[PDB]
Amino acid sequence: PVVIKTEGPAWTPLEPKLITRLADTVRTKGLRSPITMAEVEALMSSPLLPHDVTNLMRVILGPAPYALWMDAWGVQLQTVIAAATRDPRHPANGQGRGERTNLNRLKGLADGMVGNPQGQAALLRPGELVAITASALQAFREVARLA
């Protein structure tokens, strides 16, 4: 998640305990359990960075489900990109001419974001995190749907 500090946007990791806790919930209750779904939604109630979502899912999901989540997330992000491309006023876009979002940014792969949650927090816009988070969540639901 991101919190606005004095110097600006800063990265704050999701509590390790809640992540472990959810991993247990997923393992004990299953992906299609209202308990799991509720807990995942709760953990994803605060806008997350690419770094947050991928590591969250990698940990709470098995290798196969995680591979499925990654494909689902890619599809979801692409739908966001298609919408942000068609509508300049899309919230994922910045107000400025050179501020349209792209798939690299949403995946945290753009210049200065690669493997760096601090850089992602400093570079991604609030609207991009919203899309990244909603996309990750929908991808989770898809994985649970196909479970």
**Residue 68 CB, nearest approach to Mg ion (Å):** 8
**Residue 16 CB, nearest approach to Mg ion (Å):** 27
Task: Please answer whether residues 110 and 104 qualify as being in contact, where contact means their C-beta atoms are separated by less than 8 angstroms.
Answer: yes
Torsion angle of the four alpha carbons 53, 57, 59, 64, in this order, in degrees rounded to the nearest 10: -150
Residue nearest to Mg ion as judged by C-beta position: 71
Q: Residue 106's closest CA among 147, 61, 90?
A: 90
Q: How far apart are the first and last CA of the chain?
A: 28
Nearer of residues 65 and 119 to Mg ion, judged by Cβ: 65
Q: Which of residues 57-86 bind Mg ion (CB under 5 A)?
A: 71
Nearer of residues 71 and 87 to Mg ion, judged by Cβ: 71
Task: Please answer whether residues 139 and 56 qualify as being in contact, where contact means their C-beta atoms are separated by less than 8 angstroms.
Answer: no
Binding-residue total with Mg ion (CB under 5 A): 1
**Residue 64 CB, nearest approach to Mg ion (Å):** 11
Q: Which residues bind Mg ion (CB under 5 A)?
A: 71
